[PDB]
Each structure stands twice: as C-alpha cells, then as structure tokens.
Amino acid sequence: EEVRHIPVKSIIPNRFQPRTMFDEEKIDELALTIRTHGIIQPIVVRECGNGRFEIIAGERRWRAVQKLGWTEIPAIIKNLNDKETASVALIENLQREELTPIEEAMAYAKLIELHDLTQEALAQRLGKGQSTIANKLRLLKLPQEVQEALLQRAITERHARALIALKDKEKQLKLLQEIIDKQLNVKQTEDRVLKLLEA
Amino acid sequence: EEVRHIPVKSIIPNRFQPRTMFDEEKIDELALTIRTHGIIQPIVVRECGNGRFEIIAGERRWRAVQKLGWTEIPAIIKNLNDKETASVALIENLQREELTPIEEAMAYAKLIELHDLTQEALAQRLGKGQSTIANKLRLLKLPQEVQEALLQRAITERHARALIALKDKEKQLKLLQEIIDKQLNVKQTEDRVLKLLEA
C-alpha cells in the first residue's frame, strides 16, 4: 500500500542467506545506476522487531545505497512469520532470470543510440569496462543464426567471439553446428578458428 | 510513495524491449510462486498516456499474473519522459545477478528443512522437475573446494555432476584443477571421469 523510507543502518540481511557470493564489480554498477536515476524498485522488508527490519528482497540495492552513503532507503513492509520470510526470501532469489549476452549487447546499442553516446560514455555510465562494452556489441555483427544460438544459450559469448574473426558467414555457421553438436568448449573453438584462418 | 493496483489488461510492455527471449518454464514457476505468497515486489510502470501504463520493470510478474488470471496487478507509477523510461528499462534488466547453482542447491535444502518437505514436495512448489531438484542438491555432497569453484562460477554444474561419480575427494580435486586450468568442457570431464572409474 505505502512505500516507506527506512533507515539503511537499522536493516539486517536475511538470516537464511539466499546469496553467499556478492560481486562488488556489479554492486558498484548498481550504486552508480542508483546515483543517476535513483532506486526504481523499493526493497521488500519485514519488521525483524522494534525499529529493526529484515530484508526479504533487495540486498544489492541496500549495499549499493550504503556505498552511495544514503541515510535512508525506500522499502515496502509486509508482516510475515519467520518461516514465510525465509521461504519468500529464497523464492525471490530462485526466480531471477539474467538477460542473455545478445540482449545485453542489444541494450548497449539502444543506450548508444538514445543517449547518442560513445562506447567510453556507456562504460562510464553502466560502471563496466570499455573492453566489455565493445566486445559485447561486436556480437551484433555475427550471423543471425549465431545470434539466435546466443539467446537460446546454446553457445557462450566467448565461443561466438572467436567466430567473429573467421569473417565468412558459412565458415562460422559450419563451426556453430559443430560447436553445439560436438559440444566443443571455448578453447577448441578458438583452436579450430585459427586452424581455418591458417589454412 | 503509494503502491497502486492497476488493470493487467491496460499494461503494454516496454517499446525498447530489453528482453527478447522469455522461458515459459520459469514464468510458470513465478505464476505458481505468486499463487502461494502473492506478488512480493510491485511492478514499476509509467503512464504511457490516458489509462494505459508502460512497464518500466516487471514483465515476468505481469505475464505470470496474466496466466494466473488476475484482473489487476500492484504497480508503482513514476512520471518519466520516453528517453528516461527506455534507459531505466534497460538498466533494471542489465543489473540482474542470478543465484549460483550451489546457492540454488543450498536454498533447495533450506526449504526442505523449513517446510519439512520431500524432493517431490519441493519440485511441485517451485514448479520444476524432481530430477532438477535432486541433481542440484547432490552438489552439496561434493568436496568444499569444488563447491567454492561452483560459486566462483569456475565450473558449470554439469562439470561438477560428473565429479560426484568419482567418489574419491582427491581424484575429484585433481580433476577440478585440470578442468579449470586445461579449460575442459562437460564432455571431456565426463570422458575423463569414466576413464578413471574403468582404470
């Protein structure tokens, strides 16, 4: 019903920790993205007790704003028993789907058009490397079938990166079918990619 | 400030689509998980115009509730220009971190303890297969170092699954170092795993 502003310092992460490993590279991108357009989704908490709140969902948002130095955060309070909290806390983390590398690439291109930005401008805004931005956009040059493999998560982005060098659609497609069917890794893809350019 | 209830049928997904591929397997797990404990995080929308709302963030929530047959959904309305919406819409999707397979496993074990449930009970509640639940929990039996590799995303869950069969900690660890350093795939791991049990 009501979005609430709650003290960042009075918040304790969920006892049944759903997340054990936390990438600071990513969490900083979040703190940066929150500096620009603020916290878009409030953090879900329950009252742990008197004036203290247990995070249901939104640890990264909490840690990013902590780094930002914000004194309070937007929350939604839901009355829940200790069992409900732990369950929900695990489901909101189990039911997360990350965007596919091709889509991450597509999005990067959208922001390049919309904010009329350089690959350096993008890296600075999204809190990642010029390298990572450039290399992911390069995947849009790949043949469409390879691009569809990327979304179907048939191939990794590193498998595809090597295929960019072949510079022949047919050769790339022939290898793609080998990679998925033979189930090649990144190493033996790169290996095979070089052998072809040599020959 | 105020969480709002808005008509599911008056909502249009973002024009600059951040997500192109949508796994129904997952989206159904979400609709199921929403049947049980409801929509925990309201969906962020802007007013596209008169009585119509453009999704900023929460397409999966929207599609899951649509399948559930819900007539309205909880939203947060933010006034934004067409440029702001598109940008934010891409960032809320770019800054998503999925849980690591070991953590997905750990969470599954928590719910098994908390709801005192069978692997079948878990599969039914989380909307996935008994197989997927069983196979992911089996990773908790693996040696700790392998488990740390899993969180560091050094190895895939399929690389690890094969190592469960070796049933010797040392042999598993020796292979682990080979997998990461030699950069072996799932195929050549399984291959090597069998060769050892044969010999």
Numbering used by the authors:
A (entry chain A), B (entry chain A): 26 to 224
Please quote the authors directly.
Here, we report that a nucleoid occlusion protein Noc is a CTPase enzyme whose membrane-binding activity is directly regulated by a CTP switch. In Bacillus subtilis, Noc nucleates on 16 bp NBS sites before associating with neighboring non-specific DNA to form large membrane-associated nucleoprotein complexes to physically occlude assembly of the cell division machinery.
However, there was no clear electron density for a bound nucleotide in our structure; instead a sulfate anion from the crystallization solution occupies a position equivalent to that of the β-phosphate of the nucleotide in the B. subtilis ParBΔCTD-CDP structure (Soh et al., 2019). We further observed that helix α5 in the NocΔN26ΔCTD structure swings outward by 104° and no longer forms a bundle with helix α6 from the same subunit and that this movement might drive the self-dimerization at the NTD of Noc (i.e., the NTD engagement). The lack of a bound nucleotide in the NocNΔ26ΔCTD structure prevents us from drawing a conclusion on the role of CTP and the possible conformational liberation of the amphipathic helix α1. However, several lines of evidence suggest that CTP might favor the NTD-engagement conformation as observed in our NocNΔ26ΔCTD structure: (1) CTP/CTPɣS promoted the crosslinking between symmetrical E29C residues, a readout for NTD engagement; (2) the conformation of NocNΔ26ΔCTD is highly similar to that of a nucleotide-bound B. subtilis ParB (Soh et al., 2019); and (3) CTP/CTPɣS enables Noc (WT) to co-sediment with liposomes.
